[model samples]
Target: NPIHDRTSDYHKYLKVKQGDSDLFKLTVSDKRYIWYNPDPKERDSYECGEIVSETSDSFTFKTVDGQDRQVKKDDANQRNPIKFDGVEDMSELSYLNEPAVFHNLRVRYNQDLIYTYSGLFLVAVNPFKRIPIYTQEMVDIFKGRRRNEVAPHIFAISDVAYRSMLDDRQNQSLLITGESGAGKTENTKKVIQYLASVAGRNQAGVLEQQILQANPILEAFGNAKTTRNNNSSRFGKFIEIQFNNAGFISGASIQSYLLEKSRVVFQSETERNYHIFYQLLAGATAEEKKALHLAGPESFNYLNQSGCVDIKGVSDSEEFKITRQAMDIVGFSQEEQMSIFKIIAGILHLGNIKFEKGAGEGAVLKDKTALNAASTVFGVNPSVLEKALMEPRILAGRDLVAQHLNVEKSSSSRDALVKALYGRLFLWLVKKINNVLCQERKAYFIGVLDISGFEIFKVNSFEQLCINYTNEKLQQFFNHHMFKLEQEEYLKEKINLDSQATIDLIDGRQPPGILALLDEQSVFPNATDNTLITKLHSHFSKKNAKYEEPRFSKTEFGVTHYAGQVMYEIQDWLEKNKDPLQQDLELCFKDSSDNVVTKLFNDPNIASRANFITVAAQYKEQLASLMATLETTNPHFVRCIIPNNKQLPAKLEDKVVLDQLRCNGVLEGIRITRKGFPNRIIYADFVKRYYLLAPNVPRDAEDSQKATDAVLKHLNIDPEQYRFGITKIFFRAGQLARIEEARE
Candidate 1:
């Protein structure tokens, strides 16, 4: 039986207070363990039971064995019994508060259960391994089930979005985020898989297969092995899976952003570059290797830098075949596939082109063999490629002069070329995928944003700044859309709800805003990293408590972020912000025989453009565009959580886990959710949804308020659980759960 349906029986029982009458049932707040005694001044035993009797001073319970026991109602340790039928959802938790409920959630996770609910929000914990919960049978179970009808799972979230889209005809977005290795990527894949499975095929071709196969292609180029995760995503991507009005999978497009291009030339110890490099060496055939003049992975400086050529349990050679197969399934022609790998092979050979002092003023390539192989792979003339890296002709104020580059400058030029080539190649791959998978005309889409995790590395740099800044923006968006909106709506009802101040502290939009300050420093002609910190301190250190110059280092400044305070080192800040690229390097590919390579570097205006936007400016523009797209869609949030650093199951580090919750606003989100109105429906909307709950009341009532009131009265809801506003009805957490159960 539904808990709310029995409310009238319980409501009547409350009125018979003070009498020792034979009560049929009683409800209490705590359910963990109840303390009771059969006689006064006798020893008490702690046991689990349901309350069956109540008096003014004490409540009584019937244990599993039918033993009647009583405990004082006003005891300090006594807790309210959870009022729900089962532990299917955490929102049904009697406490409905944090630290207590959080512990319950942790207990659930430890038991190999990964999903929990906080009202409409679904929280997922990474299980570190695949569980049997997401089978085809499970997808069928969740196909039309209500969110609470099934065990908490990501599929439930997907099903709700799908059903709501069909019924309401609104576009939906699943905004999945967490620190790296929190299983955001896996969750995203499952959502797509579930939607594809349930929606079925609309066309003759299996588009779902193509959609699913795109992941391997993407991971090959965009994912890397880091210290934190074996296959951490190095970029941000938003996938829009388009569906026609009839709600069948039609087409898809992927938009990627902020790929960590620096990984091309540099990597931390124990880390590897993007998976494709090793995959190519491991998977290529003898003839193919001969054509690209390829050697072992150790022969390339880029691949050998980290000394990590292999990942445990992951066969790079096999993965290489898988990537090619996926590309073919996605409609990449044989020629196009080879072209893509040729550029990849070219990047490897380019990394091995050693530099030495020239006979006179300029640098020369010590390894002509590597240089010639790169020229062959890239389809460029050896002389022009060598000239582009050594002595290049530049027009200097009415004179065309040959500028000579030393060995250091030449090496920097080589690395820069490698980075640019890889970055542009990744973008091109996404474009090609979009061209093949995207439909010309579509009704709507459910976008899944699987972005890189929040990073705090041993040495944070410009790349970290970009990634962390993106996270800050995402966090702010979550706060505004989730908590701020809820808080303000309740305040409009003349109810007090706690609102977060973290956004204002992080997004001040003035001299104090971290992004704005960073932008300002990026444009300064001679601003050093130390000067940027000095400027930050000079502007806001005294005024804003969150801004501080740490006593430990002069080259670093700290911001107390919602997640935590991170001190960013400022060495090479200006140079990295500038993101200088050698325009002359484009000459190597401009006239190449390979059309893909030529097209990437062959713009006529490339050599003439004098000034380019700084890295920060470009990121800001891209993020703005992404935010605009997100704003227009109804958003859903799935916060993936990492249990511990070791990636071991059933072992949780309390402080580490708690810090992630705090940083990502899950803790604060729970606090706000429990303290405020999370579920709301306007009077008109409320009646539209719940009219069946009160069939006795006429639907023709001119005023929606009267219609809503009649439904609430019919349902026998307590007045304390809801509030009436001028235009809407605000529900305390779990009240709607009752109404939903009733509707079903």
Candidate 2:
């Protein structure tokens, strides 16, 4: 039989002085059922109390109605808040401070809420002790702020991590990329803001001005609004701010990648469209308007959008003014700024050129209006201007008027030229601005990327896929930065420590393949667009052993591709179908036969071929194991479960699909979570540390029990050395009352 040998030898790592104190026991079970007290006949259960009482396979707890409730292992409150039972309530800890405890108590704070939405399950190893875990430290470092300072973004965290790792001989880089409007740009700014505050040499007073001014100039062209988000970034930015020996900013350089030039000219319905289109159309000065040859914001079918909102706090004309101001701040001469604006003005003017209904199919200029506009600004002949717009070369062998055609093939070539021209113009603007602060690469740099996020559409096409792929790579980068001990060990040993590490570990969704395919011209003899398409077709073909062929469908523009084939018009028109019906599953399982066959053949080869399969399996097991451990170790149980309203609309009327996801995803995520943790261990451990230290007086013991009293006192001790205190408090309610009386 189990014997209770109350001795002071239990805590080797702890030392508590003898005094008035109490102790409680911790236990765990399958289902979380609260009883408050042991006696079934007792009318009063502990105030708002008791959880999880039962046998190994089955658990029964008194319901709110005082009736016994029983549940199977499989069928339970799948979304049940994770419960913890410990010896110490943690509220008595000194490092936490009386005020903090009161604040939480005042708000009736629930830790479960933070976990449910964020997908983070936090537990204190010692509920009595106030100490920060690694994740908390990381969040504090990145997201924490000192008076009036903005928080850092992913890039700043990268910088901080890099700096910390510098002496350890490690390289760090922050890669933030996503589809348009994914908060990439805003995040980039946060990172930069944090870096400037902590890493810059100049005082806050001086540096804040420079940082704020620089951003407006960048946003004027780089950011815009789309169907997904307002103020979405159109371009991908890479900013590397160099730091020298003392961890101070030396200089910075900005490199930008592919920007959507088409957005500069066109857009679709239900989308508010780009910011510059409206900015230029509505905000341009008369002289600016005259120079740009603009009519109005409503002139372009693309810009004449409904639901368009002018950003409240920011001003476009004033942004133009600040661009001038930043030029001055960055030490730009008058000539440099003017030259840059001239180029932007020229592109604006170029948009105004009209052809006489395109002579039959390909247009020829009927009047010299475009030429006159160009000449009016640049002092060139109408014919010369036309030549530049059409074809920039003058045919070396024959400069005759008959051979001096303005364009080649007139249709696609002209459109392509316009696209290229605008793209180059955009690059010119950034290069001009970047030149003011920095222009060369340095040893170490903090790169801030302010790009957009993903865009999900009814007819998600090539561009969407490309953008989504970029997001996949970025998420991978983040995952690498947040690698845990297991992951690090796995990398060092070149072994699979867990399953998540195995499957599609780093999703190879980069769009480099698409770029490679598109860049394929006849002259470059490696692979062409045809070759890329052929590879995809072959890879997705029924004959392929690895996986099924990707599905495809025809659209108004081209053959659209996704994970499955979809009827273009049918799917596109169903954008408003917000119900979680078979239609949604239809897209997910269009080629079920192929998927089933592939899975059947691949199951046995999972160890070699499927890492995701392995990881998913292991993830489940690990969570179950961890939970079991917590339950057996802790004393008192508090299962925290907070529903998240973030993904949910602030005011959803009839959210069928969205609501289904919330209810289903949460239920599924939990019910399937049995393999990761063991509740018993968690409960047992929490009790040993917190519960014993919780009481103010050891009542059911000998008067000469100095050893037990000392142990409880040590457990109750709460000193204030802890800096980042999100400490755990684990203790029983009976012991809590005694401690409260003594403290009072």
Candidate 3:
């Protein structure tokens, strides 16, 4: 506990000798790019150099030592990521994460470096190049405050939830929601690691191993290679653990959301679909699969990525072993584990079975359909999968007669079963993970969300837009939590302190919170399309002056942005869009709770524009004028650029993929608002994307002048302000050192 002794729970520190910079190295990319502090003996090891330039086949890093080394992209050093070993106590360590750096900046400068501008928060890196400070004591204080004792950043948030549960004596739900690859899964593991290290009373081997195994097993089914991440989660999860009154460990339960079943058979160009589908078809043992009536990868039309070919890194039996081992660690008996796989295996076969045209209106299957799928998956009849689906659930109507609710009918019942089991299976997996993480004591739960962070796919599919927006919401949640909106509301009231306290009292009084008003389902009779948002806008516009009419956009998509501090609707844009806007917004939000007063449920295209980063020298003057406010607790945020986590062609000429990757990050920065996490967590990465611009034109005189003129037009600064306006510009390709001089 000596490590715990020196540090606060808010930040975890990694201790290293002045010369031991090798302890941690950041791999800036999947390959051909890596960076570490130039001088390990220096006071700040966090002062590593950035990649100066990269080509199709090589990249060069500018070291703090004032030397630049160009290395091949496929070099072994670049392939191996920086080893980030756990530091027992940060107090002994120098740098933490970016937020710690930001907090230090805020404390030292007494202002936020990142702020909303032109509707988007632009991030400006420290120009002085001074390393941000980190302290172990602060982390301990927050951890102690949460866990009732000192810990590190890993366990601090978990500890806080534990303490809240202890105080309320109610099962306090700690929701850790973020888009996938934003470190949710990695952070979740750390949470478990922290809890097992500090909270668990049971023997380490059994408890810890079980928790660790859950990951690979979850990834095999729950995660897949996506445009945004190497392993992106496709569902939602909620964990409820039963803990003892003394805060002892206990059992757990999990609830999950949507899973992309289509990925089981199909993936986008360059991206392999689901691991399980390819694993089963390409790698499953014939005897083993025959036992389950499963088909090979060639049996399905979607098996091929292009016209025909198999994806790599897929193995069915290998994954099954991984899955089974994970289940065992979680203490899942053979029967229980089998039950879960049975669902997955069933879905696999269900995906393969072909349907034929029916003699009349109904469809027919080539075979009776595999019962092993139904029986093995859910112990139900294979025929019933279609029959029950074609047949509607009969609920007693007003007359007490059962009504058949037929939504859609197909010839193949297996198809019905395939869709139903996978949909439910997605939910089932969430519950499964929850069940394992739940401790027996007083509901000590660890919630891990593995959905995509932000995505930019071909043609920008509905799913990508929806997930991106979810991230945006989560980012907003983090921002508001760190910077309380309620407090802002009190200040916005422009009331005296006494009256503000009374107002706070009213808003804080009870179970509903501000969210309940937006959840008034009774207000909208049909509740179709953007009904909730429309209704909430109506309610808020009428009740509060701070609420402005939300600006709606069609060309910019169905997304909306609020003007100023007030909620104003952009009617002109909303009216012009010809696309289906209603039900579209639903895909962008997590739940109705997301549609609350904040921008979570609003349009993302607008939100992205509204996010601003404070790069102006008069930042202090600007923030001071807005209003001086106090935060109850300083919220934590982590920002890191998510490099292209997968392989890209070494050929630089493929501008399409490169541009897609570039725009992908930008769009992700925009759509990330849909998630409920405080935007602070994901905003760290978006910071670089928003503030930096690259037109990619040549560095010739005309191009330089155009770039200059563009900046002038964009900022609307007078020629007199050009000095500050042309703060910095770089030649991405051919010439650079002199272009800046000419502009001067």
Candidate 4:
């Protein structure tokens, strides 16, 4: 066929204009020539058609299906583009290094294309706009193809994971991560959309639609409008979608961690509270609003703060409707939903209650009306509520003692109560959703972890420490699983390289690790910020090089994370670590007339003090459990990147981009991949795969090493590019990629 012409595939041409019924083939060598043609529409298009015959002034060409066409070339340039030449797969790049990968990414991102593959890693750049690439028809196009057979897409990743799970009957996890506003949430939603569309049919459409509806409810509660992202996720979540043996989604569950409930009472200038607060205010019916005692967003202290009540392009009223619909779809009852809104409204009113100096170093209610509104909303007695905030009732042995709280102490108690109420409410929402979403244990699962990404700001706090630390652990997982473990296996099989002991300083069992020292320091009742710093310094600074005290500040210490150095200030380290909630407020909520609120707070676990754990300790425990669950499954990572800080479309700031690259270990990953053998296969699998390349290789399953040698000799790969162990063969980065392409 004319479409098989090798001349067109290798020709170098720039923007050619041609007239109809005329074409010409410009000769470059004895056989090679420029196959010239212009599209019939009188516009530029890449690889329009194949050249068939050439006249003195015109050339005839045939389409891949044998349709004839002729055109005259107006102009052609012979300058070859070095950066890219219609390259679809980045693994095929001539120079597979950091600079080349960065340049290739910039080129593709400038064209409004975001997704690319660097070997097993899928890199996504945030485009900051809805790019119309996620239609159902487009999903159908990506269904059953290998990664290299089509354009790089998140759907391809989802499809591969889904197919792999069914074929092997093993669980899978797609660990999608990046910095905030790097499009992790959106990409996560796309993965779910594709999975729901392609999988899940056993319940007809109920389970599929339910799984899809879970996002709006989660976002309404867990996501907020931030300065960096319009809808930034403030918590971490791993959503496990379970599938039966027949490859259908049976059920799903969502596990959340470290919600920034502090944001409920406070926000920076450009940020807003959670969406449900505004949604309720905007979307509540006239009677619902009056019954909930709502006036407007500005009427609530929590909502009016930061001077941001409405987000541009988002209609709070419309979202409120959508959120209610989602809640209804997710099996939330009318009373259950109403009770949730009532607690939300109560928190709003609770924030507005002001305190003033009272007799004998105590605080009293300055706004009795605000106090009454909160009491009525939360179904607590006015007297009990008044004393709970002003002078908390603490259980001393067998007696109840009223601790006299001054203005500052009373205000702090109020803030603590607000945070606890909202935090519990957020978890309650998660539990309710999980109750509806989680099904019986299925044969397999594909968990998608979409958590808050690495963050550093002008003012970093305990929250930032937790976030960055989570990223550090995840990066360690990526590096260890993707690179270190493979190389270690090679070592075990006696194919050795300069493999050093890569210490996991973060989660090591012994002292000097950051989390371990933090847990140890957390046990002391009188541990001050200085003592914690001194402790970490004495424990780590003398032994481990990764842990160090900051040169500028005594209250601050730094840990050289896989990402970068993060100096954690321990100003309120003890207070934040303890994170004690007021028992009086807990009792008030637990005694509420609302059954949902009562049941949520009345859990025996909530009242138990025997197994109390610090906030940081609880986080460590939860993360350890999550990591254990993840370790049992095959992991796929989507490394998301934010190209610029301005959140503008099609903008690439090189320094900002490169810093994230270095911090997230992308550059180090590439360098390690380049220097080490990243792809490995057992002797049997290796011979089975490349036997066709070597025609003389025998199909001897017993003596696979001879077959492997024959195949290697036939392919003529450089000896330096690969190495053979006692039982397996390891290929350099992209060496196996070339074989995969060849297989395709």
- Between candidates 2 and 3, name the one with more favorable TM-score: 2
- Cα lDDT of model 1 by residue, 290-353, tens digit: 8888888888899898988889899999999899999989989898888889999989988988
As a TM-score, model 2 comes out at 0.55
lDDT of each: 0.74, 0.38, 0.39, 0.73
**Each candidate structure's count of clashing pairs:** 7, 101, 97, 5
Worst 10 residues of 3 by lDDT: 732-741
What's the TM-score of every candidate structure?
A: 0.78, 0.55, 0.47, 0.79
Provide the lDDT at 80 for model 4.
Answer: 18
Q: Tell me the lDDT of model 3 at 59.
A: 76
- Misplaced by over 4 Å in model 1 are 1-86, 202-204, 358-362, 393-400, 483-527, 543-546, 603-611, 676-744
Which residue pairs in candidate 1 have backbone atoms (N, alpha carbon, C) closer than 3 angstroms, thus clashing?
Answer: 28-81, 29-80, 29-81, 30-79, 30-80, 30-81, 563-663
Candidate ranking under TM-score, highest first, comes to 4, 1, 2, 3
Local accuracy of candidate 3 as per-residue lDDT tens digits, 1-744: 544433422222222212423211222233222434345364223334456788899777876676886667554122111222222221111222222222232222222121111012211112121222223333334444532243223345556656665665655433343333444555455555555544567553554565556666666676777765555666654334446677655655554444565565557765555556555554546775666666655555445453333334444557656666676776667665545555556665555545455455444555655533544444544444444433423324454232232222332233433543454445445445656565444433434333444454323433443344444444444445533543453244331111222122112224321223322442334453255445545544445443334455321222221101212222221111111122222222212221121122243422221223211111222222211211222223322222123332121111222232222232233223212211121122212222222343323333444555553354344443222112222111111111111121
Off by over 4 Å in 4: 1-86, 202-204, 358-360, 395-400, 484-527, 605-610, 676-744
C-alpha lDDT (0 to 100) for residue 598 of candidate 2: 22
**For residues 688-740, could you state the per-residue lDDT of candidate 4 as single tens digits?**
65676676865446779878887787777788888887887877755654443
Q: Candidate 1 local accuracy as lDDT?
A: 0.74
